[PDB]
Amino acid sequence: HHHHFNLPPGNYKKPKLLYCSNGGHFLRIAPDGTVDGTRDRSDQHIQLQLSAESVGEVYIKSTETGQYLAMDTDGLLYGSQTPNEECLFLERLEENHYNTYISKKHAEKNWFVGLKKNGSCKRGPRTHYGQKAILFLPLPV
Secondary structure, rough: OOOOOOOOOOOOOOEEEEEOOOOEEEEEEOOOOOOEOOOOOOOOOOOOOEEEEEEEEEEEEEEOOOOOEOOOOOOEEEEEEEOHHHHHHEEEEEOOOEEEEOOOOOOOOOEEEEEOOOEOOOOOOHHHOOOOOOOOOEEEE
16 A cells, blocks of 8 residues: 554554644544644543544544544545544554554545644645654543
8 A cells, every 4th residue: 555554552442532742732623623632631522532444444533522533635634523535544653652643535645633733733735754743642531
């Protein structure tokens, strides 16, 4: 395919917080579908349940609202009420430590899930291997 296959350890048995080491924000999918990051651990919209659709391919869903993380045709993350092709991400190990999520739909363009230091999501085309914005650590809820 277009990418390596080093996979992170850990599993999907329990929900997780997706912590971005760039600004220290947790990925958040709000009830209205907007996606961004927050440093508030008490937020009820940062609890995410991941599930494997195929080895290395995942859905990332808000446990609070049931919404799926998805990246649209112009690279913007949004919350989807139903699972579709834009909701699948290739979950990979990075720097022998972190988890990265590449849009399956746009994998050939290397579009990643990423959070900027200010907590706003990065648009797909603005992401790339090597950035801290794409590095996540799944933490217990």
